[PDB]
């Protein structure tokens, strides 16, 4: 009965494609024709941090938009002070291979993990005066790629075992498992209301999971190669992604399809990281062309360039107050812009 | 004007000094990457030198080496292969008892990131390979080969086949056999040559 069910699956795919085509009334260009262009913008470096001796792989901002955190292959985790460029902590690491970092919303915890198949949590408010490892999470079978904090008790991870998980810090047990992907996954994005999250794998497909139920609700397939970055729109009803084929796309969770694409003839190298501004009008994007870029999220047109890095950028993030964007390459230098 | 930010500045300076001291003191060790196919004898020569990534540390002639074994995980190799860039050399391994190894070597040799890193190739299990050759011909693996059924000719033919899989003249390939704990001397010679070349290049003379 394998052929019968295969034909039924093909019929269902045709039916859903027909439904999407029927619901596809008009594109975004016609609606956005009357939008006033934002115009060219220019940004100048306002600070530079010099304390790393190797490549930089990940970073994360803070809730109060003053304290940073960075990770490097040298095995050192450093918590920075953006305003005075000072240093507040320096955390040695068990393994030098590190791929991700995250800062807890309450400011009490920091998480990190890499090729050791373990996510570590550090307590930064110990009575003894130092920082020690609260607990280590070990339930994955592949290298970790991303980590996020829900509360001071729940963490969501995304390994390279074609799965995403939801943990419980107090007891370190797998609360819920997310399955359905067919390849390595490296992305995450927690919704502003903290009830849904979407991830992008190497299959050029993305899924909009459900935190409470645990069952995926939608799937998007519109790219040509692997996926490297993702970020929810500030409103909470859209998201954007960057792929290895040197083109970004903006999807939707109501029309269940694409809206617009950001393409250029000269751009050849792949995308490294993608993020939105405070009002969602600007779509910051990293690159392998030794520079960053600014895309007008509505008109899908070029608006500015943020150059000044010797090597390709590997991370990106804007402040919660929306006043500064921070980038980091493998040349061990982080630039705070404005 | 600072009231008690001076204590913060002092803490920052102490942290920076400790970081610089640790960074300077940690550059005296070189790193080595182990590659090859499954069950290629890499663990054999790793143990004879006395779950994601397994590293080994040992010292020899006032110099401490660092070994890394990566084939313990099954994922996209191109996803994490960039993490091992800027490594001194690659210690490949080949077992003369089996085309998978040749394809892997052809893939890794022409990679963009490893276009200049030297490669050390360790043909392994000489005795049983020679016994099998003297007992059965190698025509099953290489029907296009020709020559006698002796030992030296087959080894030379296989070495030529492995050597002909490179394209960049800049890279230098070192070939040695094994199977008496003398591999440390060969590794030391290769790393000394690499270090001398790097020192000459850094001064602007090379």
């Amino acid at each position, epitope marked *: 009965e394998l052929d019968q069910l295969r034909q039924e699956a093909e019929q269902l795919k045709n039916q859903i494609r027909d439904a999407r085509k029927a619901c596809a009334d008009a594109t975004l260009s016609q609606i956005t024709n009357n939008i006033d262009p934002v115009g060219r913008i220019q940004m100048r470096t306002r600070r530079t941090l010099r304390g790393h001796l190797a490549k930089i792989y990940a970073m994360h901002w803070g809730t109060d938009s003053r304290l940073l955190v960075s990770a490097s292959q040298d095995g050192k985790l450093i918590i920075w002070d953006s305003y005075t460029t000072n240093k*507040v902590h320096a955390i040695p690491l068990r393994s030098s291979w590190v791929m991700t970092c995250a800062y807890a919303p309450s400011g009490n915890y920091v998480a990190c993990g890499g090729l050791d198949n373990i996510c570590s949590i550090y307590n930064l408010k110990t009575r003894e*005066g*130092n920082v020690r490892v609260s607990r280590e999470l070990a339930g994955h079978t592949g290298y970790l790629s991303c980590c996020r904090f829900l509360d001071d008790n729940q963490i969501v991870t995304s390994s390279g075992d074609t799965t995403c998980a939801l943990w419980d810090i107090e007891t370190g047990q797998q609360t819920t498992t997310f399955t359905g992907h067919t390849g390595d996954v490296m992305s995450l994005s927690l919704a502003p209301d903290t009830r849904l999250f979407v991830s992008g794998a190497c299959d050029a497909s993305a899924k909009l999971w459900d935190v409470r139920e645990g069952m995926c609700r939608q799937t998007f397939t519109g790219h040509e190669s692997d996926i490297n970055a993702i970020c929810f729109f500030p409103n909470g009803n859209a998201f954007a992604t960057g792929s290895d084929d040197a083109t970004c796309r903006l999807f939707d969770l109501r029309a269940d399809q694409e809206l617009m694409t950001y393409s250029h003839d000269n751009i050849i190298c792949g995308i490294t990281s993608v993020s939105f501004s405070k009002s969602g009008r600007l779509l910051l994007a990293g690159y392998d062309d030794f520079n960053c870029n600014v895309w007008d999220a509505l008109k899908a047109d070029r608006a500015g360039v943020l150059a000044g890095h010797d090597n390709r950028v590997s991370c990106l993030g804007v402040t919660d107050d929306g006043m500064a964007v921070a980038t980091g390459s493998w040349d061990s230098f982080l630039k705070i812009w404005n | 004007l600072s009231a*008690e*930010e001076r204590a*913060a500045l*002092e803490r920052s300076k102490a942290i920076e000094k400790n970081l610089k001291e640790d960074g300077i003191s940690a550059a005296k060790d070189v790193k080595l990457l182990l590659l090859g196919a499954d069950n290629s004898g890499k663990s054999t020569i790793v143990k004879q030198m006395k779950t994601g990534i397994v590293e080994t540390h040992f010292t020899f002639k006032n110099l401490h080496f660092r070994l890394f074994d990566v084939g313990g995980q099954r994922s996209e190799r191109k996803k994490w292969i960039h993490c091992f860039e800027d490594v001194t050399a690659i210690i490949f391994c080949v077992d003369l008892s089996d085309h998978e190894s040749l394809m892997l070597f052809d893939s890794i040799c022409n990679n963009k990131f490893f276009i200049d890193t030297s490669i050390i190739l360790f043909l392994n299990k000489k005795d049983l390979f020679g016994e099998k050759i003297k007992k059965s011909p190698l025509t099953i693996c290489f029907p296009e080969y020709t020559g006698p059924n002796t030992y030296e000719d087959a080894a030379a033919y296989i070495q030529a086949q492995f050597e002909s899989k490179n394209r960049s003249p800049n890279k230098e390939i070192y070939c040695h056999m094994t199977c008496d704990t003398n591999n440390a001397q060969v590794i030391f010679d290769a790393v000394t040559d690499i270090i001398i070349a790097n020192n000459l290049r850094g001064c602007g003379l090379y």
Partner: single-chain antibody
Amino acid sequence: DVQLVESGGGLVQPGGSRKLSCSASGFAFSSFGMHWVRQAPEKGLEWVAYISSGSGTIYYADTVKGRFTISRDDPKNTLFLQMTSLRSEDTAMYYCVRSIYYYGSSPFDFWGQGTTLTVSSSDIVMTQATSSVPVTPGESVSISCRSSKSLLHSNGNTYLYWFLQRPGQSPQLLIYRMSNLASGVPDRFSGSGSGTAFTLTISRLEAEDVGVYYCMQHLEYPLTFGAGTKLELK
């Protein structure tokens, strides 16, 4: 648990000498500061010395400059004080305290037990208006502590700390930077004020709040405490 026990004090005839040690155990001594605080037998607390982390910097008071010596030994985690040429008006009690500084830190969090010394025969000034007030249980009362200069630094935040000493033991920290609650303090205490006029508000009293309240300052060396206001039941 964190411990800070002092020893060395006793009976000293005039013109003698003595050595003190306030041994530390139970935490990371290397990254912390250290102070010595003196309280007269029937008066308020007073500040004496200071030493940084790693012995990088030292400070001293006016009346003790050139007569006291302070030393630290990191491997043993001990603090030393050298009493040379003790005068006739130097009998008091001495403690040692923890003074870590960074962004968002809470200095003076822990205090020692204390030892008694017996002898034979442009500065900022802080004052407390009242001395003793009767408070009925279950009510809400407020206190005042007026300084002589604006404590508002350029960075935006001001430096005013509130200390409470119950009758019988060493003081405990209540509020740092005039707005932040220390760990282990109930949420019924509050801090308010701006520039020079400072105050502390407490409501829903209990029996354990009887004691004396001292307001300190940390803008610039030297540091000056307050006289001390007593609270009594009924």
